[PDB]
Amino acid sequence: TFKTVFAEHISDECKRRFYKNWHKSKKKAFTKYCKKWQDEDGKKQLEKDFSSMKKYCQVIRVIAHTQMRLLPLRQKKAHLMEIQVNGGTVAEKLDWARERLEQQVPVNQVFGQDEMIDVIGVTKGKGYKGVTSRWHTKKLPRKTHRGL
Amino acid sequence: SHRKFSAPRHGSLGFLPRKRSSRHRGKVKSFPKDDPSKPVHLTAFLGYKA
Amino acid sequence: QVLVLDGRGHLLGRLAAIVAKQVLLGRKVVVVRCEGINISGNFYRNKLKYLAFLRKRMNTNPSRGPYHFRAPSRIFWRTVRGMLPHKTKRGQAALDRLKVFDGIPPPYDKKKRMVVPAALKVVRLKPTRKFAYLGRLAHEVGWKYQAVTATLEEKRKEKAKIHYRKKKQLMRLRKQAEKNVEKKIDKYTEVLKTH
Amino acid sequence: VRYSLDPENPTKSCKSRGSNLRVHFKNTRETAQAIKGMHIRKATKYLKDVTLQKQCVPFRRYNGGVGRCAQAKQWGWTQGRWPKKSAEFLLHMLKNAESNAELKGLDVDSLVIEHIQVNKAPKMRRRTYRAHGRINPYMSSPCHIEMILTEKE
Amino acid sequence: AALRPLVKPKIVKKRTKKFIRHQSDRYVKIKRNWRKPRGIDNRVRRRFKGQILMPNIGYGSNKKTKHMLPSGFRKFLVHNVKELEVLLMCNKSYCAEIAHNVSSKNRKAIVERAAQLAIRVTNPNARLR
Amino acid sequence: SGRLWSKAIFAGYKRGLRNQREHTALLKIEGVYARDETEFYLGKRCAYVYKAKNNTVTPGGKPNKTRVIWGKVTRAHGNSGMVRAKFRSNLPAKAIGHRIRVMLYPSRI
RNA sequence: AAAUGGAUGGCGCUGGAGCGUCGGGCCCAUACCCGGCCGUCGCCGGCCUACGCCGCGACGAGUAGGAGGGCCGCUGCGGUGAGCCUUGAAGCCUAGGGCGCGGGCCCGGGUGGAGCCGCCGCAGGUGCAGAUCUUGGUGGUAGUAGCAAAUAUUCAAACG
RNA sequence: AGGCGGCCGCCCCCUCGCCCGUCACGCACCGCACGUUCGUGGGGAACCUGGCGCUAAACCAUUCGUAGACGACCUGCUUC
Ligand SMILES: [Mg+2]
Ligand SMILES: [Mg+2]
Ligand SMILES: [Mg+2]
Ligand SMILES: [Mg+2]
Ligand SMILES: [Mg+2]
Ligand SMILES: [Mg+2]
Ligand SMILES: [Mg+2]
Ligand SMILES: [Mg+2]
Ligand SMILES: [Mg+2]
Ligand SMILES: [Mg+2]
Ligand SMILES: [Mg+2]
Ligand SMILES: [Mg+2]
Ligand SMILES: [Mg+2]
Ligand SMILES: [Mg+2]
Ligand SMILES: [Mg+2]
Ligand SMILES: [Mg+2]
Ligand SMILES: [Mg+2]
Ligand SMILES: [Mg+2]
Ligand SMILES: [Mg+2]
Ligand SMILES: [Mg+2]
Ligand SMILES: [Mg+2]
Ligand SMILES: [Mg+2]
Ligand SMILES: [Mg+2]
Ligand SMILES: [Mg+2]
Ligand SMILES: [Mg+2]
């Protein structure tokens, strides 16, 4: 990881992701970072970071999150994901990313119908179960002492 | 020895470290490769099983 | 203090012998360009021996037991481990003194690389005998990092070409100054007292 | 009577002891190691939290087969247990030490517990009734408790 | 600077370890006094390398430097005044050593008689008020 | 100002394959790499400089933290230019791969 | 062609660190030579504890076993030290000082409160690491197994 | 696996920033070691002083089930 540049308008769902106890937290994240984005003299030390990003990096990933306000869930924390842009050259990938900072990405934009797209997730936890349920081995008959 | 009824083995050696994952959001191990011929797009989105 | 060794055109066993002898004396030696270390014999023979070494593993638990590195720097470091008394607190300190690097790091770009004469392929091997590249062996088996290391190596070779023209220009300027006048009075004394 | 680790002076220090009292030596040692190095009001609140099962006692040495708890992360330890009876007896002896400091005339609000000590009292033997008509001993493990408290300056 | 006795050379002992007994470290029922093992399998009796060393005649000190204190005298134990006065002839090589069961009331008289007769005593300042 | 002693690295004790003899130690001295070259250094005097936290030094001016076990060159050792040395006290065995000073006195210039 | 993954010891070794013939050096064992010290033995010296004191020379390993010495030790007995002490004996502890190669011993510091020791002879129920040793006590296990055969308890008040 | 180097406009001084020659001095500590070093060497707790800034986060508790033997993991808690 060379350097990470975060946007200015960071949502409260992302702040709930960064904190653990949102009740006990004083909501103090990214105050100086947004002050650096707001200051004009800090932009001259910030636009050089993208010029170094154009020169040295090849893999650029885009951290995005979900809107928990549209969901019927109770979690209210937004999950962050790095999304590797597999487009053209690093210069226009950076231009595309800075053009679409602080913006929504619909699924109908990138993904389409009749497409073969794999799903990655975490299985249903069944708990601390035994051998004939986990490994699906053959059971022992009724006559067996000390375990079937 | 000479087990006399050879059976296919239960389970898989490739999925053997059956530890709980430290993360619950399933991360991406590998993204597809890139090229300047293809236009600029994203690869991975989030979702919730309804 | 510190020693920086080339790996181009060196043999694995000879270089490991000289490094493992000079690291027990305290000289902090570092072997750079480890992917360029040659190994005598046929390359199919060397990868057959290394495939047998990979076959050597514990049946009860492969993690708790034989670790098998694929990077050539760690191959050379295992070669020096098998020669130093690493189970005692002399060879462990010697391995802590030893550092190994694939490619060339940026401080070792600047710091000058030594070439050991007695470990050279040209000195030790007849040129009509076969050989094998440790970097080629590592790229064939496991070490997937030749496309990055070779690219950065060509980049620093271009940096070396853009430095050598400036150094040779400065050497031409100082020899023009030596060709110029009013230095010979000390030069008579220097020639009569061992120029 | 004599105490191990005699204090700097008997003027600014009080002392207390319990002898031949039916507890477990391991539980009282593991709660005394948590009491030691603590202000007296913090220790009183700590033992009331032990009796209310709100703050635990980590088992650091005598930790054989002891289940875990979530409350042990304040101590940097994984296991824990809540000794009710040991907390009751050691709170009674802390009240005894408070009364002795009141008799000696110290600044009763600023005592700290510098020294605490626990060692095995002579145990009393009972018997079980196991298989095949055999008799195995069923013995207690009481302890002697010593504590030396000191003003904090 | 008390008496400074006659010519006594450099005292060597050829080893100063007061040889430990085998497996006295492992069991605390065994006192650390030497006792010759007579087993048929013991590495100490078989004299393997890397083991303890048995006391034999080779560790005997020199007869000139035998029973020699580091001060340069030879110690002799004393109970009373007459057994102190027997050392009147050879006080320049033989020093006195008052017994442990001698009280202070007689110990001060013994050390006073030793100071008068110029006889070295090893413990002059013990058990005093 | 300037260093007067020649550099020499402690290598180990006089030993066989199995056992050791700690009364005589081995020094890989720099510059010498030959049997004919380890002739001038016969009779030199060595010194191992180490540190301790108690205040025990030479009477040369100021009290410091430096302790030194003295010794001198006995004879040569092998064909590679290694030099035997017997010190006044035996080596602490911590000096392996560390430096022992060799000063240019009683030799015969 | 053989079953665990492994063996010129491994690492590696090819103008050798392989093979056969050899040259000059280099390294060490308790082997050899010189020297210091102890002991045993042989020969011997002196009218200085004669059972002591010196001198020369050669050698010292060892289970079963056999001798000699012990100013090694424990218990008691008779002589013996005008012995030791309630101004502190025996016993015990001790990062103290020391001796003897060793059995062990003497002194320093602390608890203790009434008997103890050196030499010469005498007599032993006289020295412990073991014997699935006897008696007594105490650890790891371990705050572990276990407080589960016979359907089941609950609210309020009272003495406390 | 980056922190030192190069260029320009100025800065308070230095034309002994070095070699060759003359002159007079500074401890000459009277025969003695561990001396001169990259050292304003590395880490920890405090002491008095100037300027520029910072005003939190974990763990327990409670709740939660997408999670659980116990731990552990994902969660909620604003006065609208
Ligand atoms: Mg479940
Ligand atoms: Mg059955
Ligand atoms: Mg991956
Ligand atoms: Mg356990
Ligand atoms: Mg448990
Ligand atoms: Mg029962
Ligand atoms: Mg019965
Ligand atoms: Mg045998
Ligand atoms: Mg091999
Ligand atoms: Mg050959
Ligand atoms: Mg014999
Ligand atoms: Mg009495
Ligand atoms: Mg006696
Ligand atoms: Mg008997
Ligand atoms: Mg009897
Ligand atoms: Mg016994
Ligand atoms: Mg026996
Ligand atoms: Mg038994
Ligand atoms: Mg028993
Ligand atoms: Mg009894
Ligand atoms: Mg028991
Ligand atoms: Mg239980
Ligand atoms: Mg029942
Ligand atoms: Mg009531
Ligand atoms: Mg009532």
From Swiss-Prot, chain E:
A Pfam family reported for this protein in Swiss-Prot or TrEMBL: Ribosomal_L32e
N6-succinyllysine, modified sites: K49
Subcellular location as annotated: Cytoplasm
Cross-link Glycyl lysine isopeptide (Lys-Gly) (interchain with G-Cter in SUMO2) mapped to chain: K8
GO biological process, one term: translation
GO molecular function annotations of the record: structural constituent of ribosome
PROSITE patterns linked: RIBOSOMAL_L32E
Keywords: Cytoplasm, Isopeptide bond, Phosphoprotein, Ribonucleoprotein, Ribosomal protein, Ubl conjugation
Disulphide bonds in the chain: none
Main location: cytoplasm
GO CC aspect terms: cytosolic large ribosomal subunit
Database matches in PANTHER family: 60S RIBOSOMAL PROTEIN L32 AND DNA-DIRECTED RNA POLYMERASE II, SUBUNIT N, RIBOSOMAL PROTEIN L32
Described purpose of this protein according to its UniProt entry: Component of the large ribosomal subunit. The ribosome is a large ribonucleoprotein complex responsible for the synthesis of proteins in the cell.
Quaternary organization: Component of the large ribosomal subunit.
Protein's name in the database: Large ribosomal subunit protein eL32
Species whose genome carries this gene: Oryctolagus cuniculus
The encoding gene: RPL32
